[PDB]
Amino acid sequence: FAKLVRPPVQIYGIEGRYATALYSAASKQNKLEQVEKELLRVGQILKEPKMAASLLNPYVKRSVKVKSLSDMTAKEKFSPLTSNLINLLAENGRLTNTPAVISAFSTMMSVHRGEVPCTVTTASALDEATLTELKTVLKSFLSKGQVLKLEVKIDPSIMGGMIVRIGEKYVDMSAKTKIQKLSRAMRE
Amino acid sequence: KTGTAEVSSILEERILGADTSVDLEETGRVLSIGDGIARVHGLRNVQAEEMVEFSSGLKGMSLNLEPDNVGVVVFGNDKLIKEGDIVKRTGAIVDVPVGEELLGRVVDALGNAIDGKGPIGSKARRRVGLKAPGIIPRISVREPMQTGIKAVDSLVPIGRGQRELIIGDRQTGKTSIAIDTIINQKRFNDGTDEKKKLYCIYVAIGQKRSTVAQLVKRLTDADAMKYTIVVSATASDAAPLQYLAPYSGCSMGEYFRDNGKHALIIYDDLSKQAVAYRQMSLLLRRPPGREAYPGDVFYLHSRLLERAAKMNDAFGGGSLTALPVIETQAGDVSAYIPTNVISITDGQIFLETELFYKGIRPAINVGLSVSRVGSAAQTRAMKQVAGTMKLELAQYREVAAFDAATQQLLSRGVRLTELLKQGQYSPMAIEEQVAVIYAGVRGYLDKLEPSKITKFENAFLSHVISQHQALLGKIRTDGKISEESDAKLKEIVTNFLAGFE
Amino acid sequence: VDLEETGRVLSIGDGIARVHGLRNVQAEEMVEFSSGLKGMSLNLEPDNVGVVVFGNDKLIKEGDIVKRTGAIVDVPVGEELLGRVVDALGNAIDGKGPIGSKARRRVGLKAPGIIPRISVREPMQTGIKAVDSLVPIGRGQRELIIGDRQTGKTSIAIDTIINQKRFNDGTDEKKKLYCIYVAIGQKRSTVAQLVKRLTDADAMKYTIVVSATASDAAPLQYLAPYSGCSMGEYFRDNGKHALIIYDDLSKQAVAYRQMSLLLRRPPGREAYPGDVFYLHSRLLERAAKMNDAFGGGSLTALPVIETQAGDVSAYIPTNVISITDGQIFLETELFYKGIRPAINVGLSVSRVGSAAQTRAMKQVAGTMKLELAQYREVAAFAQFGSDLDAATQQLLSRGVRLTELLKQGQYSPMAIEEQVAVIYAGVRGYLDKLEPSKITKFENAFLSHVISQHQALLGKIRTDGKISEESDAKLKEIVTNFLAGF
Amino acid sequence: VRSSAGAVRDAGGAFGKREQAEEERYFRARAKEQLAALKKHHENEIS
Amino acid sequence: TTGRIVAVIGAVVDVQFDEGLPPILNALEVQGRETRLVLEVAQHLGESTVRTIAMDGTEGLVRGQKVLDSGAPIRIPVGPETLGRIMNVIGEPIDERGPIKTKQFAAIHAEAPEFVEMSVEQEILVTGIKVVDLLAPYAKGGKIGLFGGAGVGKTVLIMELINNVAKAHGGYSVFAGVGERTREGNDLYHEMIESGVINLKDATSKVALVYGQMNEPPGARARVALTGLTVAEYFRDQEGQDVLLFIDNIFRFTQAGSEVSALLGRIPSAVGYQPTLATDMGTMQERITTTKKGSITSVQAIYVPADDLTDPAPATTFAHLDATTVLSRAIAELGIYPAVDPLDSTSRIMDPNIVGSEHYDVARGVQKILQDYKSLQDIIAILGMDELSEEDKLTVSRARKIQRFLSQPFQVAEVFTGHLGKLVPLKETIKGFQQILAGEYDHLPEQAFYMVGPIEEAVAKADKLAEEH
Amino acid sequence: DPAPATTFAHLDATTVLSRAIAELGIYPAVDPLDSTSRIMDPNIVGSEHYDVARGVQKILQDYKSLQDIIAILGMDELSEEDKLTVSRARKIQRFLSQPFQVAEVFTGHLGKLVPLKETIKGFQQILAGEYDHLPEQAFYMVGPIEEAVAKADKLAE
Ligand SMILES: Nc1ncnc2c1ncn2[C@@H]1O[C@H](COP(=O)(O)OP(=O)(O)OP(=O)(O)O)[C@@H](O)[C@H]1O
Ligand SMILES: Nc1ncnc2c1ncn2[C@@H]1O[C@H](COP(=O)(O)OP(=O)(O)OP(=O)(O)O)[C@@H](O)[C@H]1O
Ligand SMILES: Nc1ncnc2c1ncn2[C@@H]1O[C@H](COP(=O)(O)OP(=O)(O)O)[C@@H](O)[C@H]1O
Ligand SMILES: [Mg+2]
Ligand SMILES: [Mg+2]
Ligand SMILES: [Mg+2]
Secondary structure, three states: OOOOOOOOOOOOOHHHHHHHHHHHHHHOOOOHHHHHHHHHHHHHHHOOHHHHHHHHOOOOOHHHHHHHHHHHHHOOOOOHHHHHHHHHHHHHOOHHHHHHHHHHHHHHHHHHHOOOEEEEEEOOOOOHHHHHHHHHHHHOOOOOOOOOEOOEEEOOOOOOOOEEEEOOEEEEOOHHHHHHHHHHHOOO | OOOOOOOHHHHHHHHOOOHHHOOOOOEEEEEEEEOOEEEEEEOOOOEOOEEEEOOOOOEEEEEEEOOOOEEEEEOOOHHHOOOOOEEEEEEEEOEEEEOOOOOOOOEOOOOOEOOOOOOOOOOEEEEOOOOOOOOOOEOOOOOEOOOOOHHHHHHOOOEOOOEOOEEEOOOOOHHHHHHHHHHHOHHHHOOOOOOOOEEEEEEEEOOOHHHHHHHHHHHHHOOOOOOEEEEEEOOOOOHHHHHHHHHHHHHHHHHHHOOOOEEEEEEEOOHHHHHHHHHHHHHOOOOOOHHHOOOOHHHHHHHHHOOOOOEOHHHOOOEEEEOOEEEOOOOOOOOHHHHHHHOOOOOEEEEOOOOOOOOOOOOEOEOOEEOOOHHHHOOHHHHHHHHHHHHHHHHHOOOOOOOOHHHHHHHHHHHHHHHOOOOOOOOOOHHHHHHHHHHHHHOOOOOOOHHHHHHHHHHHHHHHHHHOHHHHHHHHHHOOOOHHHHHHHHHHHHHHHHOOO | OOOOOEEEEEEEOOOEEEEEEOOOOOOOEEEEEOOOOEEEEEEEOOOOEEEEEOOOHHHOOOOOEEEEEEEEOEEEOOOOOOOOEEEOOOOEOOOOOOOOOOOEEEOOOOOOOOOOEOOOOOEOOOOOHHHHHHOOOEOOOEOEEEEOOOOOHHHHHHHHHHHOHHHHOOOOOOOOEEEEEEEEOOOHHHHHHHHHHHHHOOOOOOEEEEEEOOOOOHHHHHHHHHHHHHHHHHHHOOOOEEEEEEEOOHHHHHHHHHHHHHHOOOOOHHHOOOOOOHHHHHHHOOOOEEOHHHOOOEEEEOOEEEOHHHOOOOHHHHHHHOOOOEEEEEOHHHHHOOOOOOEOOOOOEEOOHHHHOOHHHHHHHHHHHHHHHHHHOOOHHHHOOOOOOHHHHHHHHHHHHHHHHOOOOOOOOOOHHHHHHHHHHHHHOOOOOOOHHHHHHHHHHHHHHHHHHOHHHHHHHHHHOOOOHHHHHHHHHHHHHHHHOO | OOOOOOHHHHHOOHHHHHHHHHHHHHHHHHHHHHHHHHHHHHHHOOO | OEEEEEEEEOOEEEEEEOOOOOOOOEEEEEOOOOOOOEEEEEEEOOOOEEEEEEOOOOOOOEOOOEEEEEEEEOEEEEOOOOOOOOEOOOOOEOOOOOOOOOOEEEEOOOOOOOHHHOOOOOOEOOOOOHHHHHHOOOEOOOOEEEEEOOOOOHHHHHHHHHHHHHHOOOOOOEEEEEOOOHHHHHHHHHHHHHHOOOOOOOOOOOOEEEEEOOOOOHHHHOOHHHHHHHHHHHHHHOOOOEEEEEEOOOOHHHHHHHHHHHHHOOOOOOOOOOOOHHHHHHHHHOOOOOEOOEEEEEEEEEEOHHHOOOOHHHHHHHHHOOEEOOEOHHHHHOOOOOOEOOOOOEEOOOOOOOOOHHHHHHHHHHHHHHHHHHHHHHHHHHHOOOOOOOOOHHHHHHHHHHHHHHOOOOOOOHHHHOOOOOOOOHHHHHHHHHHHHHOOOOOOOHHHHOOOOOHHHHHHHHHHHHHHO | OHHHHHHHHHOOOEOOEOHHHHOOOOOOOEOOOOOEOOOOOOOOOOHHHHHHHHHHHHHHHHHHHHHHHHHHHOHHHOOHHHHHHHHHHHHHHHHHOOOOHHHHHHHOOOOOOOOHHHHHHHHHHHHHOOOOOOOHHHHOOOOOHHHHHHHHHHHOO
16 A cells, blocks of 8 residues: 555544545655644535535435536645545545544644644633733743744633643643642641 | 554655655555464555465465455464565455366465375365355255265265254264265266266364375275365464365365266364464454454354355256364263354264264264255155154154064164164265165065164175175166065075075 | 435345444434335444345345335224234235224334333133133233243134124123234134134124244244234223233244344344333333323233243243233143143242132132132042041042133133123032033023023123122022032 | 253253163063053964 | 445445345346356345345456346246256256246235235144144144254154155146255155156156255255245235145254345344344245135245254244144154154144044143153152152053054155155044043053054054064 | 363363362362373283273263162162272272372372383273272272282281
């Protein structure tokens, strides 16, 4: 068999297998950026009410699905990789879970260019000065080449403090867990 | 629902439009080899149960034709196959060589010679999986197949074209029955009555090679190898070989059957072909059934034993007798596979493992041994003597757990039962069998001691073979015991008895 | 296209359609296929629906259109069914025209609670001595009839059904009993001969035969008991008394197992799903005896079970033995040695007991039970017979006579007063001086004699429901006089 | 489990064989006596 | 329409269509085969795929092969021309005498007679066998079963029944052999030709053999019963005449379904049987019936795996018969042939109204004395038999005499026993058993009754034993 | 079980040790009627050896068949030949037991090697009947039959 080039991040499931196949196809020929473009364009195309309703009916012959998808991939002059991918999905019958596929690819592309995702949780909004110093400190966690991809969020449950997720690392500065730890210590 | 071929290595080929460069019609690539079963991607034109040839000389047999891959079984050890190996068709349903060249060779399940005497120079090949004769080709079993074992030839007669079944616990003497049968035909094969020559085939399934080597030595010793084939799929051999060995042997015999010749084939054991089949099926992810045996383990043996037939004279008059050997566990003849085969055959020899210690060897458990063909496949002289002998044993068998009349009955029964013992690899001509049975059933041993009949048999046989061979020749050629022959036998028996003490 | 009130078959095979759509379909609802075929929606899954087809799937293509009828399964009811032969859904199959029933009921209704009921107290006369005396059956009971093959279970049921004719032809209204006979997984010719037999005894003017025969799809055999039980709950809830006979309840379990294993539900023991208890309990718990505030009606049940090799520890036999208020074993060893009905009276029981016996039959069977209990513990000696004292000798000389009184013949149930008279003669001791082989003759004679001359005494026993010492003395005189001239 | 009637013969153990042999013994004896009596009657009846 | 094969696994083939889909039970012909391979559709899996069971070996099938939907279930020739022929499951002849040229074709799948179409008459059918006629009388138009282990007498008994009844029958006959030895099929064919029942030259044959012997792949053994049943259906309805239908074996019809079940994707039931065992057998056994428009006197041999009458298959069949004669291995070991078990063979016409008071009393007397003997054997095991009382030694002796007298020599067993086959009309059987019970033969040895016909022959045999003594 | 059931076909000589015998104290617990060999041939081990071995097995098998009755009706319900057979069978069952060298720590007894000729001779004698006067226990855990006679002498005092 061929030596498919391993994508940076590994995904699993049918979505992950299709995404890995597409990533290794595009990586050879160095067509990642454009391929992502056509993928995020079929993302909009497939949401079209007519196509969305037509592709979920199981009572239209599969060949009809493939013919319609070839029609809708020739009009946009999609790269041969994306047209082949969509024909493949229609043949195998997995296009019902295309959004999981393309989404996975997006993830598999972020990890390529270093967008190590993060996530900050707090009980209130954050002042842009405080948020900016936060970003500046969080940047110190990464390596060279990587760039932070922050994502603010709000939860009321945690009283104060803060919660930070940096890829896999996780620091719970929240006051909820501090209170719980103190309560356990002063019970046990 | 994830197809086997829904992998990255394949979908990548599909995506970047490179699949057209490779042949996916008469060729395939191993997706996943493991435990002796390959999945192959490609071979869109491979026939079901066709043979295929891997890229290292190993062969396989494409059993499963799934929508996207092919479940192939390797006729060997998969140590040499690797994911990505190229599998290329052979074009033909799996078939084995046949002919008279195999005679006297220790061939292997696929027809390769493992005796080291050089290649088999065969000419024709037969598919292993062929249909058995129909209703019309056959006729009723009429000729006798002389086993050479007093008990079998007397009370469990076996005809030519009949499927017996030697069933009994482990180490009770089943292979011994088979080898007595093979060695006996030596007298017929060394002769000119071309219509009585019988060609033997021994299929050794899942038996250690030391056993098969000792058996082949035993056959060469009696020079019973010039007319014997030995299809040896021993324990070390992959499951598919042990599953195919019976069919290779059966086709080697269908050859002699389809040419007016008479063959005997001895599968030993069939309970190990069933185990090999179960392993194969479970490794192809086929759902199990009883005791994990695949759902269709009856058809497996029925389609094998149904090929033992007796062709009419418009089809050559050939014949193929089958003697499957089954092994019960604790006399539990009511198990799954023993019960499967007991209803497929017509007749059955019950080797009991306590008749085997109480003294009776061969352990044949008369009364439970039947031959649905019956007296129809017996010699006239043996018919005559066995008619009385079977009845007398049948009476003695219900008063055995002990007057004057019944005491005489018990004495006679014990005399007969001591007349049915025998050694090994020493079968007897039918004439001698009828001679001794007649000696014992008329009453010319009602006084001699029980422990002395074992030796009187041998002494009387030596005497007749050395003094009155003309009588035996007359009985054998005439087939029946003529009145003058009966009187000659009476004279001889009384004379030897008087001067034996 | 509509995918809420309508759907389309994704798949079919072995009678289990897999429909896509029908988003508003309820569980256990009756959908209809385009081919005039009905079906019941059992599996509601996120992606599809598992419909069990009431009929042959030959007519259910793929892509067919299925429309929900909007209702749970329901069956007709009323006295318009009496004397008819209906199938598992109320459709007539006797070819006497339509059924013409105004009302309807849901097959899967729930049983009455704990307060509506009242303790079982009336006797349900089966017309069989061995049953009516030793293992009595009240009204509102559930008395399993459990036995082997060809031991006489269906005959017990049919004798019970035939006996009620004397009550149904009278004018007393609280003794009338209406019978229902659910015949599950039976050769149609068997049901036809049974209907003929009931007609012969004229017992088919108050009987409803519900027929779910062998050819019928699994859902119909699964559903027949509930159809019958609803047609019986109708009589229960209207101050009337019913008697429903499921025959058998093991074949309903087999049909349910088939549907489950084809819907791919986790197998369980012997491949029976986990609901083969819930299935039978929520059926047999509908045999009740409503108190007067609810009408006073009742509904007896006589589930029939076949046991393979007298194995009553199997799955379904034990499931249905732990649900019911008794059991009537029918052993074959006794069947072939003259004891017919072959009611093994050692293993048979009735947890209701003598609370459901008429005072006369209580008076007599109370001591008959003890006499047979004593006989059963020295039965083995019967062969030796001699070499034993007069105590056990008299024990097993009384036991033999008592046993030979309990023998009975096809389709000839006896009125309670006549059973009482016969058992009185036998147990009070007016037979111990008689050769056992003749006992039956005596019975078949004595009975007739009493029927002819002394009808007034039988009327008094029947009405008073008790053996008054005046009646006791008169009966002793009758027995002595007859036995003298025999 | 319970006990049936005539289960000793079914079991086929030593007791079953022993029973069958005993029965055959007794009825062989009685058959010999009956055959003798039948011959004697057939001779006593020619007269 | 026209589909293409997509997967071959054992005897189960999936076929993908692009035109309309073929309903279930249809027959699809595989294009490109030397000999006709017919696939009977069995499931719709969605995506215009159908799962099917191949009626003949799937050797040498290729993914993508073309398959044509015939448009209707397996249709077979019928009419009075199939008489004397031999047929496959798919109806094409296998006796090498040219095509079966009929006007009538019938589809082997058809619903059963409705409840309003059944008959309710029962009249004993004298067979000439003492045990069968006495304890479990058969019935004209009824379904009859022979439950046997292996090698007890099912086939010899059914050949005896053929010989007896089919030869003396006004109507036609049919013998569907489902999955049993081919040796036996050939034996029967030659026996009939040599006995005149079949006739090769002219049109005077009264038997229409059908064969699905045990070399046919399971898809074929599970259907040939329906084919023989269709021929019998026609003779029952269109000819408007009486019919016989011998099936041997009817277990293989269940075993084949079990074999194919797992590959069809069904969870297995209790003992490895298919979950649909009961219904797959009801839909067949409910077409073998008398009706107001005909009559079938079906006889069926039934394997009992390992002599286990509690197995699901025989256990389920017991409910579909009007009369069962449970052959037993234990009785066959005593040499009594036929081995019929008197205390397990039952019937539906064994009533004092249908067979008469005296017949019923004698049958019940035989059963009761045998049961008493069974009870006594337990005591005889320990005490010995000299210790038995004098009312029981009589019981044991009489029971042994009755056991022997129930045996009989058949005309088809002359090869085994050598004796001459006999027929014992009903009156001789009832009279002989009356006499044996009454005690009118306490002076004859028991062995005087072994393998004899009427009672007078037992008397003559006793005299001959005495003389030769 | 599938594992031993499968391995039974790969061995020349099997030796089935059984818990039933070991619970009787006999050691080694070998079961005489399940042990087998492929060289139990009169042409390999001679005729005296083969005949003695087969006589031992015949008598042990007869005693096993009797055990079913013996366990209920006692030995008082056997013929005289059967009583004699049972006595010989018990003597042989005991005589098969041997004390091993490695089991001194268990038993204390001294471990014995019994040459083949001594074994054949002893079993031939027990079968002939030369020792019907000794008691069973005289044979329990002894080497050659000389020790059996010596122990029977010890027990008599
Ligand atoms: N007639 C006989 N007389 C004496 N010994 C015999 C006789 N037949 C067989 N044996 C002995 O039985 C032993 C096993 O016999 P054999 O191997 O033929 O039976 P088997 O059951 O096929 O063995 P296995 O099943 O283990 O392969 C052999 O050692 C042989 O010596
Ligand atoms: N009380 C009785 N007296 C005499 N015979 C009886 C009696 N009850 C039943 N029988 C006989 O027993 C046989 C079987 O009867 P029945 O059909 O009632 O048993 P079953 O259990 O319903 O049979 P199945 O299990 O096959 O449905 C019948 O032929 C019948 O004649
Ligand atoms: N009536 C009979 N008389 C004598 N022997 C018989 C009789 N019936 C059966 N047998 C013996 O029992 C065997 C059973 O074979 P058969 O009945 O033909 O097959 P099945 O196993 O289907 O019963 C016969 O081959 C025959 O030897
Ligand atoms: Mg061997
Ligand atoms: Mg019934
Ligand atoms: Mg048969």
